[PDB]
Coordinates of C-alpha atoms in Angstrom, one line a residue:
Chain A
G8 CA -187.6 24.7 19.8
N9 CA -189.6 27.9 20.1
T10 CA -187.6 29.7 17.4
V11 CA -187.9 29.2 13.6
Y12 CA -185.6 30.5 10.8
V13 CA -186.8 32.8 8.0
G14 CA -184.5 33.1 5.0
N15 CA -184.5 34.9 1.6
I16 CA -185.4 38.4 2.9
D17 CA -185.0 41.5 0.8
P18 CA -183.3 44.0 3.2
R19 CA -186.0 46.6 2.3
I20 CA -188.1 44.6 4.8
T21 CA -188.1 46.2 8.3
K22 CA -189.0 44.7 11.7
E23 CA -192.5 46.4 11.6
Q24 CA -193.3 44.6 8.3
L25 CA -192.2 41.2 9.5
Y26 CA -194.4 41.3 12.5
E27 CA -197.6 41.8 10.4
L28 CA -197.1 38.7 8.3
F29 CA -196.3 36.3 11.2
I30 CA -199.1 37.3 13.6
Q31 CA -201.6 36.1 10.9
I32 CA -200.0 32.7 11.7
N33 CA -199.5 32.7 15.5
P34 CA -199.0 35.2 18.3
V35 CA -195.4 36.2 18.3
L36 CA -193.1 36.8 21.3
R37 CA -190.0 38.5 20.0
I38 CA -188.2 39.2 16.7
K39 CA -184.4 39.5 16.4
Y40 CA -183.5 40.5 12.8
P41 CA -179.8 41.1 12.7
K42 CA -178.0 44.0 11.2
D43 CA -174.4 44.8 10.2
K44 CA -174.1 47.9 12.4
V45 CA -171.6 49.8 10.2
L46 CA -173.5 49.4 6.9
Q47 CA -176.9 49.5 8.8
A48 CA -178.3 46.8 6.5
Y49 CA -180.0 43.6 7.4
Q50 CA -178.3 40.4 6.3
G51 CA -181.4 38.9 4.6
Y52 CA -182.9 36.8 7.4
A53 CA -184.6 36.9 10.8
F54 CA -184.8 34.7 13.9
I55 CA -188.4 34.8 15.1
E56 CA -189.5 33.3 18.4
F57 CA -193.1 32.2 19.1
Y58 CA -194.6 31.3 22.4
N59 CA -194.4 27.4 22.3
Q60 CA -193.3 24.5 20.1
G61 CA -196.8 23.9 18.9
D62 CA -197.1 27.3 17.3
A63 CA -193.6 27.0 15.8
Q64 CA -194.0 23.8 13.8
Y65 CA -197.4 25.1 12.6
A66 CA -195.6 28.2 11.2
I67 CA -193.0 26.2 9.3
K68 CA -195.6 23.9 7.7
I69 CA -197.9 26.8 6.6
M70 CA -195.3 29.4 5.6
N71 CA -192.4 27.6 4.0
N72 CA -192.4 28.3 0.2
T73 CA -195.6 30.3 0.5
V74 CA -195.3 34.1 0.4
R75 CA -193.3 36.4 -2.0
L76 CA -191.8 39.5 -0.5
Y77 CA -190.4 41.8 -3.2
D78 CA -190.7 38.8 -5.5
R79 CA -188.4 36.7 -3.4
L80 CA -189.9 33.4 -2.1
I81 CA -189.9 33.2 1.7
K82 CA -188.3 30.1 3.2
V83 CA -189.4 29.2 6.8
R84 CA -187.4 26.4 8.5
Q85 CA -186.8 24.9 11.9
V86 CA -183.6 25.3 14.0
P106 CA -168.1 12.3 25.3
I107 CA -167.4 8.7 24.2
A108 CA -164.7 6.2 24.9
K109 CA -161.4 6.3 22.9
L110 CA -158.7 3.6 22.7
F111 CA -155.3 4.4 21.3
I112 CA -153.8 1.3 19.7
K113 CA -150.0 1.4 19.1
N114 CA -148.2 -1.0 16.7
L115 CA -151.0 -2.1 14.5
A116 CA -150.4 -4.6 11.8
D117 CA -150.7 -2.9 8.4
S118 CA -152.8 -5.8 7.1
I119 CA -155.7 -4.4 9.1
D120 CA -158.4 -2.4 7.4
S121 CA -160.7 0.2 8.9
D122 CA -163.5 -2.3 8.1
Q123 CA -161.3 -5.0 9.7
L124 CA -161.1 -2.8 12.9
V125 CA -164.9 -2.9 13.0
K126 CA -165.0 -6.7 12.6
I127 CA -162.6 -7.1 15.6
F128 CA -164.0 -4.6 18.0
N129 CA -167.8 -5.3 17.7
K130 CA -167.5 -8.4 19.9
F131 CA -166.5 -6.4 23.0
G132 CA -168.5 -3.1 22.5
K133 CA -170.7 -1.1 20.2
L134 CA -169.0 1.5 18.0
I135 CA -170.5 5.0 18.0
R136 CA -168.2 6.1 15.2
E137 CA -165.8 4.4 12.9
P138 CA -162.1 4.1 13.8
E139 CA -159.5 6.6 12.7
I140 CA -156.3 5.2 11.2
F141 CA -153.4 7.7 11.3
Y142 CA -149.8 7.1 10.6
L143 CA -147.0 8.1 13.0
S144 CA -143.2 8.3 12.9
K147 CA -144.3 4.3 9.5
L148 CA -146.1 3.6 12.8
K149 CA -149.8 2.8 12.2
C150 CA -152.1 3.8 15.0
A151 CA -155.8 4.2 15.4
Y152 CA -158.5 6.0 17.5
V153 CA -161.4 3.6 18.0
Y154 CA -164.7 5.0 19.5
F155 CA -166.8 3.0 22.0
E156 CA -170.3 3.8 23.3
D157 CA -169.3 2.6 26.8
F158 CA -166.5 3.0 29.3
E159 CA -166.8 -0.7 30.4
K160 CA -167.1 -2.3 27.0
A161 CA -163.9 -0.7 26.0
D162 CA -162.4 -2.2 29.1
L163 CA -163.1 -5.7 27.6
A164 CA -161.0 -4.6 24.6
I165 CA -158.1 -3.7 27.0
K166 CA -158.6 -6.8 29.0
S167 CA -158.5 -9.4 26.2
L168 CA -156.7 -7.7 23.3
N169 CA -153.8 -5.9 25.0
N170 CA -150.4 -7.5 24.1
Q171 CA -152.1 -9.9 21.7
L172 CA -150.9 -11.1 18.3
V173 CA -153.1 -10.3 15.3
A174 CA -152.1 -10.6 11.6
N175 CA -148.7 -11.8 13.0
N176 CA -148.0 -8.4 14.7
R177 CA -148.1 -7.5 18.4
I178 CA -150.7 -4.9 19.2
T179 CA -151.0 -2.9 22.4
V180 CA -154.3 -1.4 23.5
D181 CA -154.5 1.5 26.0
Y182 CA -156.4 4.7 26.5
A183 CA -155.9 7.7 24.2
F184 CA -154.8 11.1 25.5
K185 CA -157.0 14.2 26.1
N187 CA -153.8 13.1 30.7
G188 CA -155.1 9.8 29.5
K189 CA -158.8 8.7 29.4
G190 CA -160.1 6.5 32.3
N191 CA -160.3 8.9 35.2
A192 CA -162.5 8.5 38.3
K193 CA -164.6 11.5 37.2
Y194 CA -164.6 10.1 33.7
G195 CA -166.0 6.8 35.0
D196 CA -168.9 8.5 36.7
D197 CA -170.3 10.8 34.0
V198 CA -170.1 8.5 31.0
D199 CA -172.2 6.1 33.0
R200 CA -174.9 8.9 33.2
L201 CA -174.4 9.7 29.5
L202 CA -175.1 6.1 28.6
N203 CA -178.2 6.4 30.7
Chain B
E372 CA -128.8 -3.7 21.5
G373 CA -128.6 -3.4 17.7
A374 CA -126.4 -0.3 17.0
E375 CA -124.4 -2.1 14.3
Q376 CA -122.2 -0.7 11.6
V377 CA -121.7 -2.5 8.2
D378 CA -118.6 -4.0 6.6
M407 CA -148.5 39.6 19.2
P408 CA -151.1 41.5 21.4
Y409 CA -149.0 40.7 24.6
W410 CA -150.4 43.2 27.0
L411 CA -153.9 42.8 25.7
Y412 CA -154.5 39.2 26.8
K413 CA -153.5 40.1 30.3
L414 CA -155.9 43.0 30.3
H415 CA -158.8 41.1 28.8
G416 CA -157.9 38.2 31.0
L417 CA -157.0 35.6 28.4
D418 CA -154.3 33.0 29.1
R419 CA -155.3 32.7 32.7
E420 CA -155.6 29.0 33.2
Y421 CA -159.0 27.8 34.5
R422 CA -160.8 24.5 34.5
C423 CA -164.4 23.1 34.6
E424 CA -164.6 19.8 36.5
Chain C
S89 CA -158.8 -22.0 25.4
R90 CA -157.8 -25.6 26.2
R91 CA -160.7 -27.0 24.1
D92 CA -159.6 -25.3 20.9
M93 CA -156.0 -26.3 21.3
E94 CA -157.1 -29.9 21.9
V95 CA -159.6 -30.1 19.0
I96 CA -157.0 -28.7 16.6
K97 CA -154.2 -31.1 17.8
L98 CA -156.3 -34.3 18.3
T99 CA -157.5 -34.3 14.7
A100 CA -154.0 -33.1 13.6
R101 CA -152.8 -36.6 14.5
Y102 CA -155.6 -38.2 12.5
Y103 CA -155.3 -35.8 9.5
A104 CA -151.5 -36.5 9.4
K105 CA -152.0 -40.3 8.9
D106 CA -154.9 -40.7 6.6
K107 CA -156.5 -37.3 5.5
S108 CA -159.8 -39.3 5.0
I109 CA -161.0 -39.9 8.6
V110 CA -161.7 -36.2 9.1
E111 CA -163.5 -35.9 5.7
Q112 CA -165.8 -38.6 7.0
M113 CA -166.0 -37.1 10.5
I114 CA -167.3 -33.7 9.2
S115 CA -170.3 -35.2 7.3
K116 CA -171.5 -37.7 10.0
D117 CA -171.6 -35.4 13.1
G118 CA -172.2 -32.0 11.5
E119 CA -171.0 -29.9 14.4
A120 CA -169.6 -26.4 14.8
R121 CA -166.5 -27.7 16.6
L122 CA -164.8 -28.8 13.3
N123 CA -165.2 -25.3 11.6
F124 CA -161.4 -25.1 11.3
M125 CA -161.1 -27.6 8.4
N126 CA -162.1 -24.8 6.0
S127 CA -159.5 -22.1 5.4
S128 CA -162.0 -19.3 6.3
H129 CA -161.4 -19.8 10.1
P130 CA -158.2 -18.2 11.2
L131 CA -157.0 -21.3 13.1
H132 CA -156.7 -23.3 9.8
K133 CA -153.3 -21.7 9.2
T134 CA -152.2 -22.8 12.7
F135 CA -153.8 -26.2 12.0
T136 CA -151.6 -26.2 8.8
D137 CA -148.6 -25.8 11.1
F138 CA -149.4 -28.7 13.4
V139 CA -150.0 -31.3 10.6
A140 CA -146.7 -30.3 8.9
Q141 CA -144.9 -31.0 12.2
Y142 CA -146.8 -34.3 12.7
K143 CA -145.6 -35.5 9.3
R144 CA -142.0 -34.7 10.2
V145 CA -142.5 -37.2 13.0
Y146 CA -143.6 -39.8 10.4
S147 CA -140.5 -39.2 8.2
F148 CA -137.6 -40.7 10.3
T149 CA -139.8 -43.1 12.3
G150 CA -137.2 -45.9 12.8
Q151 CA -134.2 -43.6 12.5
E152 CA -132.1 -42.1 15.3
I153 CA -130.5 -38.7 15.2
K154 CA -126.9 -38.5 16.4
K155 CA -125.8 -34.8 16.2
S156 CA -122.8 -34.3 18.6
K157 CA -121.8 -31.3 20.6
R158 CA -119.4 -29.9 17.9
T159 CA -122.1 -30.4 15.3
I160 CA -125.0 -28.7 17.2
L161 CA -122.9 -25.5 17.4
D162 CA -121.9 -26.0 13.8
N163 CA -125.5 -26.0 12.8
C164 CA -126.7 -23.0 14.7
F165 CA -123.9 -20.8 13.5
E166 CA -125.1 -21.8 10.0
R167 CA -128.6 -20.9 11.2
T168 CA -127.3 -17.6 12.5
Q169 CA -125.6 -16.8 9.1
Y170 CA -129.0 -17.3 7.4
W171 CA -130.6 -14.9 9.9
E172 CA -128.0 -12.2 8.9
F173 CA -128.5 -13.0 5.2
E174 CA -132.3 -12.7 5.6
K175 CA -131.6 -9.4 7.3
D176 CA -129.5 -7.9 4.5
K177 CA -132.1 -8.9 2.0
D178 CA -134.5 -6.8 4.1
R179 CA -132.1 -3.9 4.1
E180 CA -131.5 -3.8 0.3
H181 CA -135.3 -3.9 -0.1
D182 CA -135.7 -1.0 2.3
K183 CA -133.1 1.1 0.4
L184 CA -134.7 0.4 -3.0
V185 CA -138.1 1.4 -1.6
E186 CA -136.4 4.7 -0.6
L187 CA -134.9 4.8 -4.2
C188 CA -138.4 4.5 -5.7
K189 CA -139.7 7.2 -3.4
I190 CA -137.1 9.8 -4.6
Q191 CA -137.6 9.3 -8.3
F192 CA -141.4 9.1 -7.9
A193 CA -141.7 12.5 -6.2
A194 CA -139.2 14.2 -8.5
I195 CA -140.4 13.4 -12.0
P196 CA -142.9 15.7 -13.9
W197 CA -146.4 14.2 -13.9
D198 CA -147.8 17.0 -16.1
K199 CA -145.9 15.9 -19.2
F200 CA -148.9 14.1 -20.6
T201 CA -149.2 12.2 -23.9
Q202 CA -152.3 10.0 -24.2
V203 CA -153.2 7.7 -27.0
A204 CA -156.4 5.7 -26.3
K205 CA -159.1 5.3 -23.7
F206 CA -161.0 2.5 -22.0
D220 CA -154.6 -13.5 -11.0
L221 CA -151.3 -11.6 -11.1
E222 CA -150.0 -13.0 -7.9
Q223 CA -149.2 -16.4 -9.4
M224 CA -147.9 -14.5 -12.4
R225 CA -145.3 -12.8 -10.2
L226 CA -143.4 -16.1 -10.1
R227 CA -141.4 -17.8 -12.7
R228 CA -142.3 -21.1 -14.4
Chain D
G149 CA -166.5 -10.3 -9.7
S150 CA -166.4 -7.2 -11.8
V151 CA -164.6 -5.9 -15.0
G152 CA -161.1 -4.5 -15.1
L153 CA -158.7 -3.1 -17.7
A154 CA -155.3 -4.6 -18.6
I155 CA -152.6 -2.5 -20.3
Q156 CA -149.4 -4.1 -21.7
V157 CA -146.6 -1.6 -22.4
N158 CA -143.5 -2.9 -24.3
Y159 CA -140.1 -1.2 -24.1
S160 CA -137.0 -1.3 -26.2
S161 CA -135.0 -4.5 -26.7
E162 CA -131.4 -3.4 -25.8
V163 CA -131.1 -0.8 -28.5
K164 CA -130.0 2.4 -26.7
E165 CA -129.5 1.2 -23.1
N166 CA -126.0 -0.2 -23.9
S167 CA -124.6 3.2 -22.9
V168 CA -126.4 3.7 -19.6
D169 CA -125.2 0.9 -17.4
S170 CA -123.5 2.7 -14.4
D171 CA -126.1 1.5 -11.9
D172 CA -128.0 4.8 -11.9
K173 CA -131.6 4.2 -10.9
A174 CA -132.0 1.3 -13.4
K175 CA -133.3 -1.4 -11.1
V176 CA -136.2 1.0 -10.2
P177 CA -139.4 -0.2 -11.9
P178 CA -141.6 2.3 -13.9
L179 CA -144.4 3.6 -11.8
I180 CA -148.1 4.3 -12.4
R181 CA -150.1 7.1 -10.9
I182 CA -153.7 8.2 -11.3
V183 CA -153.5 12.0 -11.9
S184 CA -156.5 14.3 -12.2
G185 CA -156.7 16.3 -15.4
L186 CA -157.4 19.6 -13.6
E187 CA -153.8 20.7 -14.4
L188 CA -152.6 20.6 -18.0
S189 CA -150.0 22.4 -20.1
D190 CA -152.7 24.3 -22.1
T191 CA -155.4 24.4 -19.4
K192 CA -158.4 24.4 -21.7
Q193 CA -160.6 21.4 -20.9
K194 CA -160.6 18.6 -18.2
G195 CA -162.9 16.6 -15.9
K196 CA -161.3 13.1 -16.2
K197 CA -158.3 11.3 -14.7
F198 CA -155.2 10.0 -16.4
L199 CA -153.2 6.8 -15.6
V200 CA -149.7 8.1 -16.5
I201 CA -147.0 5.5 -16.9
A202 CA -143.5 6.9 -16.4
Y203 CA -140.0 5.4 -17.0
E204 CA -136.9 7.5 -17.0
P205 CA -135.5 7.9 -20.6
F206 CA -138.7 7.6 -22.4
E207 CA -141.7 9.9 -22.7
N208 CA -144.8 9.5 -20.5
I209 CA -147.9 7.6 -21.7
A210 CA -151.4 8.5 -20.3
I211 CA -154.6 6.5 -20.1
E212 CA -157.9 8.5 -20.0
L213 CA -160.5 7.0 -17.6
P214 CA -164.1 8.0 -18.3
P215 CA -166.0 6.1 -15.4
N216 CA -165.3 6.8 -11.7
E217 CA -164.5 3.4 -10.3
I218 CA -163.4 0.2 -12.2
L219 CA -161.0 -2.5 -11.0
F220 CA -161.0 -1.1 -7.5
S221 CA -161.2 -4.2 -5.2
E222 CA -161.0 -4.6 -1.4
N223 CA -158.0 -6.3 0.4
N224 CA -156.6 -8.2 -2.6
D225 CA -153.6 -9.8 -1.0
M226 CA -153.1 -10.2 2.8
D227 CA -152.1 -6.5 2.6
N228 CA -148.4 -6.6 3.5
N229 CA -146.3 -3.4 4.2
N230 CA -143.7 -3.5 1.4
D231 CA -145.1 -0.2 0.1
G232 CA -142.4 0.8 -2.5
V233 CA -144.1 3.9 -3.7
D234 CA -147.8 3.5 -2.8
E235 CA -150.5 0.9 -2.5
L236 CA -151.4 1.0 -6.2
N237 CA -148.0 -0.1 -7.4
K238 CA -147.9 -3.1 -5.1
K239 CA -151.4 -4.5 -5.7
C240 CA -151.6 -4.3 -9.5
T241 CA -148.3 -3.8 -11.3
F242 CA -145.7 -6.1 -12.7
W243 CA -142.1 -5.7 -14.1
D244 CA -140.6 -8.6 -16.0
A245 CA -137.1 -7.1 -15.9
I246 CA -135.6 -9.7 -18.2
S247 CA -137.8 -8.9 -21.2
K248 CA -139.0 -5.4 -20.2
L249 CA -142.8 -5.8 -20.4
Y250 CA -144.6 -3.6 -17.8
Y251 CA -148.0 -5.1 -17.0
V252 CA -150.8 -3.3 -15.1
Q253 CA -154.3 -4.5 -14.1
Chain E
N2 CA -150.3 -40.9 22.2
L3 CA -146.6 -40.8 21.6
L4 CA -147.0 -38.5 18.6
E5 CA -147.6 -35.5 20.7
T6 CA -144.5 -36.4 22.8
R7 CA -142.4 -36.7 19.7
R8 CA -143.6 -33.3 18.4
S9 CA -143.1 -31.6 21.8
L10 CA -139.6 -33.1 22.0
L11 CA -138.7 -31.9 18.5
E12 CA -140.2 -28.4 19.3
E13 CA -138.1 -28.1 22.4
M14 CA -135.0 -29.1 20.4
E15 CA -136.0 -26.5 17.8
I16 CA -136.3 -23.7 20.4
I17 CA -132.9 -24.5 21.9
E18 CA -131.4 -24.3 18.4
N19 CA -133.3 -21.1 18.0
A20 CA -132.2 -19.9 21.4
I21 CA -128.4 -20.3 21.3
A22 CA -128.2 -19.0 17.7
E23 CA -129.8 -15.7 18.9
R24 CA -126.7 -15.5 21.2
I25 CA -124.3 -16.2 18.4
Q26 CA -126.2 -13.6 16.4
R27 CA -125.9 -11.0 19.2
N28 CA -122.3 -12.1 20.0
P29 CA -120.3 -13.8 17.2
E30 CA -117.3 -14.0 19.6
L31 CA -119.1 -16.8 21.5
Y32 CA -118.6 -19.2 18.5
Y33 CA -115.4 -17.5 17.4
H34 CA -113.5 -17.7 20.7
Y35 CA -114.6 -21.3 21.0
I36 CA -113.5 -22.4 17.5
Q37 CA -110.0 -20.9 18.1
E38 CA -109.4 -23.3 21.0
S39 CA -110.8 -26.4 19.3
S40 CA -108.6 -25.8 16.3
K41 CA -105.4 -26.4 18.4
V42 CA -107.1 -29.5 19.8
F43 CA -109.0 -31.0 16.9
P44 CA -106.9 -29.7 13.9
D45 CA -109.4 -30.9 11.3
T46 CA -112.1 -28.3 12.4
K47 CA -112.5 -25.5 9.8
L48 CA -112.6 -22.0 11.3
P49 CA -114.0 -19.0 9.4
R50 CA -112.0 -16.1 7.9
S51 CA -109.6 -14.0 10.0
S52 CA -111.5 -10.9 8.9
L53 CA -114.7 -12.3 10.4
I54 CA -112.9 -12.8 13.7
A55 CA -111.3 -9.4 14.2
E56 CA -114.0 -7.2 12.7
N57 CA -116.5 -9.4 14.8
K58 CA -119.0 -10.0 12.0
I59 CA -120.7 -13.1 10.5
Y60 CA -122.1 -12.1 7.1
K61 CA -122.1 -8.2 6.9
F62 CA -122.8 -6.5 10.2
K63 CA -120.2 -5.8 12.9
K64 CA -121.6 -6.1 16.4
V65 CA -120.5 -4.3 19.6
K66 CA -117.7 -6.0 21.5
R67 CA -118.4 -7.7 24.8
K68 CA -116.2 -8.1 27.8
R69 CA -115.0 -11.6 29.0
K70 CA -117.5 -12.0 31.8
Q71 CA -120.6 -11.7 29.6
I72 CA -119.1 -14.1 27.0
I73 CA -118.1 -16.8 29.4
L74 CA -121.5 -16.5 31.1
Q75 CA -123.2 -17.3 27.9
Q76 CA -120.7 -20.1 27.2
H77 CA -121.9 -21.8 30.4
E78 CA -125.5 -20.8 29.6
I79 CA -125.3 -22.4 26.1
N80 CA -123.7 -25.3 27.9
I81 CA -126.8 -26.1 30.0
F82 CA -128.8 -25.4 26.8
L83 CA -126.8 -28.2 25.1
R84 CA -127.2 -30.5 28.1
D85 CA -131.0 -29.9 27.9
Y86 CA -130.6 -30.5 24.1
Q87 CA -128.9 -33.8 24.5
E88 CA -131.1 -35.0 27.4
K89 CA -134.3 -34.5 25.4
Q90 CA -132.7 -36.1 22.3
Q91 CA -131.9 -39.3 24.3
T92 CA -135.4 -39.8 25.5
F93 CA -136.8 -38.9 22.0
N94 CA -134.6 -41.7 20.6
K95 CA -135.9 -44.0 23.3
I96 CA -139.6 -43.3 22.5
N97 CA -139.4 -43.0 18.7
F112 CA -159.5 -45.7 13.6
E113 CA -162.6 -43.6 12.9
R114 CA -164.3 -44.8 16.1
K115 CA -161.2 -43.9 18.2
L116 CA -161.5 -40.4 16.8
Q117 CA -165.1 -39.9 18.0
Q118 CA -164.5 -41.7 21.4
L119 CA -161.9 -39.1 22.4
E120 CA -163.9 -36.1 21.1
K121 CA -166.8 -37.0 23.3
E122 CA -164.3 -37.2 26.2
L123 CA -163.2 -33.7 25.0
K124 CA -166.7 -32.5 25.9
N125 CA -165.7 -32.9 29.6
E126 CA -165.3 -29.7 31.7
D127 CA -167.0 -27.3 29.3
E128 CA -167.0 -24.3 31.8
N129 CA -163.2 -23.8 31.7
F130 CA -163.2 -20.0 31.4
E131 CA -159.5 -19.5 31.0
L132 CA -157.2 -18.4 28.2
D133 CA -154.3 -20.8 27.5
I134 CA -151.4 -19.3 25.6
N135 CA -148.7 -20.8 27.7
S136 CA -147.3 -23.7 25.5
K137 CA -145.2 -22.1 22.8
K138 CA -144.7 -18.9 24.8
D139 CA -143.5 -20.2 28.2
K140 CA -141.0 -22.4 26.3
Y141 CA -139.7 -19.5 24.1
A142 CA -139.5 -17.0 27.0
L143 CA -137.7 -19.7 29.1
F144 CA -134.8 -19.9 26.6
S145 CA -134.6 -16.3 25.3
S146 CA -132.3 -13.5 26.4
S147 CA -133.2 -11.1 29.3
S148 CA -135.8 -13.5 30.7
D149 CA -135.1 -13.0 34.4
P150 CA -135.7 -9.1 35.0
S151 CA -138.8 -7.0 34.3
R152 CA -137.4 -5.7 31.0
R153 CA -133.6 -5.4 30.8
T154 CA -131.2 -5.8 33.8
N155 CA -129.7 -9.3 33.4
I156 CA -129.2 -11.3 30.2
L157 CA -129.6 -14.7 31.9
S158 CA -132.5 -16.8 30.7
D159 CA -135.2 -18.3 33.0

């Protein structure tokens, strides 16, 4: 936020030299310019902190692809969710078919993850809400889809759905 | 129902304090 | 879900006698309740099961069944023997799948010889 | 709707198979596998895949495939779990065992 | 409509035939011990091979042998199944256009706010006649 990245540095450049260039842009707070401490040689880059975010984004826009140091072009750049284990899936069910089923109860933050056990197809499905995944457990558990009985419960971390887990995900959705 | 036939740093982690079980609520 | 089970099975009586009353019903009203007539809706397979059972009522209408107590046991043991025969067909299939796995993993796939460079589901039957 | 390839491989008509008849991996169909060309016997050039067709006595036959994706559909059947070897053998292979023509598309 | 009654009677006859054959599947001796005694009473009745009796198999697979109490229990349990089978059969023998379609469908618009799942027609009949229907999972074989 306050810090930008500078890449493509010839390790003949020292800390004193880096400070000269970057105060022509903005006043600079600190410079950390890392070194392998056995070989005493910089690794070609510096982390340079300015005073605020306004001086940072100005420095990226002015100095990216602008100045050559030892004929090398300087780059300047800037720098929890519900889980339902489903056991005994039908094998006629696609990962796109898991999305078509589960959108009606809750919004999916990720795509589901079909992994095979034992032969035994199982899936990790990701929900944006603790209560919208409850509608999937309420209405789909011990239900028959593609002529196979599916079971819907919580996946293991033991299992999801704790009283502390109910409180904080409510705040995360906020 | 259906069983039919046919027909290495051991002392180091205690010193550094690793593998001492501790939790963030 | 009483409404869905009723609107399947009410028209399943009418489809099983004429098949033309519902083809006239769908065009006049134009409602989202009769979406099951097309095969896209999942209940059309279950709707296919009802009308097949309604036609079996129409078959022996006027005929009485007289299976006696010896005979009903004679039928279900014959039903049981088919369930075992259907089972052993599943087992021989499961073994030959295991047979295909062993030969697939243990043949050399680096012994190449190429030459040149670049509907089946009914054709997997016999006629 | 897209464009696919169809390859019709014919086998021998009861010439040399009169000897091998002691039920030893005969009912097993020949199998196809898409193999990447990055491993070869000579290891000189590559960059393309090969649809090798393999049946036990005879020598393998390859099919070089220039484009990335052709005849690669989505949920062709109602996607049953009679896997055999893999998904590619079930979806798009055929073995007329009476006359020994192995169809693939 | 008698047509639903004739279907629901034939379905209940189908489940009982599917019920008692599950017993003869899990215990071949139920039919086998029976057909031994009928053969000395009705000598016409054809009984299966002696090998199928002693090895306790039907087509290929040998089951696990049961004691006499569990067999005779199922022999009286299939008995009340057959009494249910004949009772339904008797009444079924004693029971067995565009505007009338739309008149009922408007009467099907009654009571729209029935927020309740109904899968209890083919399931409550199957679970009534299947094995191990009384306990939570598996304590007593007896059906509901």
